[PDB]
Design a protein around this ligand. Structure first.
Ligand SMILES: NC(=O)c1ccc[n+]([C@@H]2O[C@H](COP(=O)([O-])OP(=O)(O)OC[C@H]3O[C@@H](n4cnc5c(N)ncnc54)[C@H](OP(=O)(O)O)[C@@H]3O)[C@@H](O)[C@H]2O)c1
Ligand SMILES: NC(=O)c1ccc[n+]([C@@H]2O[C@H](COP(=O)([O-])OP(=O)(O)OC[C@H]3O[C@@H](n4cnc5c(N)ncnc54)[C@H](OP(=O)(O)O)[C@@H]3O)[C@@H](O)[C@H]2O)c1
Lengths: 252, 252
């Protein structure tokens, strides 16, 4: 998506980003900030969140708040305590970008490791679900709350060596549609499939690949920017692609 | 699907059916038997499996073997011990129908109960995955092993009150496609979405509904029969509907 907006586009918007410590999440949080947003960072590692908060401070003069939450093991209650902690400092939430993710094994189903498989379901689906349940209220208390999940090409068509991850992204799509058709004109709820992007995790699943050939988290930010502003205030229940017509695979 | 075959159609086929104690699983197991198959019953409750085995005995003179396996709590190893127990008594497996399922809460995401949500993921996806991993070998040792999963209309498009269940069925579809494109010409791997059928579980999610209005597990057996015989030996990676053009909803 080509999309060129005012650096005040998100001026009075409170937006929580998961997986904000790295890759696309770090990028999205920094970009939201740079466009006015009052961003909240979520991750497991505090030092990594300190780093990110500090850079947003350098870039914008306001320092974002971070909260720690480990999706692999957090409980429903853990998620409610979080929402409560948030609630004191913020009147509401205008946006939630679910970006935290676990890849897990890329390998044949025969070799796919079950603990890892389950770890992937837990982070990508279950905890992602529980956190969105704990955050649903704060969001509903927005002029027009925007909720986006992170999908993938193997969340629309499963390919040979993808495993827990393909299954988890399908579930993400499903989960988005149930929420979308359920919050009819109360919230926007969509997925973005970012596409192959230059991050450590794309490296890990494609070591052959030359990252210089890949597009960059900054390169795909337009879509992220769109789904969060007002230019999208009527669109819900959809799955947007960041690199339309890049098509599956490695070389590119 | 209209499909009228020899009652020797599955004559020398070994077929394992999960959720064989009730509903569509009980039906499929009894129908396979009645068409020649050497059927293996899986479930959690032994007495309920005794009942079913005994009726197949009345109907066909051969008594099927049952094995107990509780998908909510079984471990990877639990699944391997099973496959081993099977392996002694059977040279291979010509078919595996994954039919065991958990509905979980039908209600808004806001009210969706997390333990139940996770229980549904565990049975429908995770354990279904681990059991198919433990059974993959026996299956590959077949002339043409057939593996089918059980999907649902909310595994293709998520609807308001479906929850863990919609998400789990999407994942099922994903899991089927990864396996299908991965066992290229080595196995057939498809889903059947049975459609609204007259079972206790359809009753539970649609109490308004009049079951007399519903089609019956025996009424949709053609598709089950198809996917398992030779008349389908080249089709893989697909999602077949039992009641094509019934369309979502209650009244019907
Ligand atoms: N980039 C691509 O090629 C592409 C393609 C398909 C899908 N995606 C999707 O893009 C999203 C973001 O990917 P990325 O490449 O930006 O990520 P990344 O930098 O490689 O790492 C993903 C993020 O997830 C977080 N995370 C993992 N486990 C967590 C846990 N248990 N608790 C809390 N946070 C956890 C990590 O935090 P920590 O640093 O603290 O560990 C990390 O910041 C993912 O959901 C992925 O599925 C991207
Ligand atoms: N019928 C429909 O309207 C329709 C529509 C959509 C989807 N489906 C699909 O149809 C499939 C079969 O449904 P049905 O109506 O035939 O089923 P059902 O009779 O209502 O019960 C489903 C079966 O799953 C088994 N099961 C549940 N939890 C288990 C566990 N933890 N361990 C082992 N087995 C377990 C049950 O065994 P026990 O008796 O021992 O508890 C039962 O035999 C399901 O996968 C469902 O998703 C059907």
């Amino acid at each position: 998506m080509h999309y060129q907006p005012k650096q005040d586009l998100l001026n009075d918007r409170i937006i929580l980003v998961t997986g904000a410590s790295d890759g696309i999440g770090r990028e999205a949080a920094m970009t939201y900030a740079r466009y006015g947003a009052t961003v909240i960072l979520l991750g497991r590692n505090e030092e990594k969140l300190r780093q990110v908060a500090s850079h947003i401070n350098e870039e914008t003069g306001r320092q974002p708040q971070w909260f720690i939450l480990d999706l692999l093991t957090c409980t429903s209650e853990n998620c409610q305590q979080l929402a409560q902690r948030i609630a004191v400092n913020y009147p509401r939430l205008d946006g939630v970008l679910h970006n935290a993710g676990l890849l897990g094994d890329v390998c044949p189903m025969s070799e796919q490791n079950p603990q890892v498989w389950q770890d992937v379901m837990q982070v990508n689906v279950n905890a992602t679900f529980m956190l969105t349940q704990a955050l649903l209220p704060l969001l509903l208390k927005s002029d027009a709350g925007s909720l986006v999940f992170t999908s993938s090409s193997v969340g629309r068509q499963g390919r040979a060596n993808w495993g827990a991850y393909a299954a988890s992204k399908f579930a993400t799509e499903g989960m988005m549609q149930v929420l979308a058709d359920e919050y009819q004109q109360r919230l926007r709820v969509n997925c973005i499939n970012p596409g192959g992007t230059r991050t450590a995790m794309r490296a890990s699943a494609f070591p052959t690949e030359d990252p210089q050939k890949l597009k960059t988290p900054a390169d795909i930010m337009p879509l992220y920017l769109w789904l969060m502003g007002d230019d999208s205030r009527r669109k819900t229940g959809m799955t947007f692609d960041a690199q339309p017509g890049r098509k599956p695979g490695i070389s590119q």
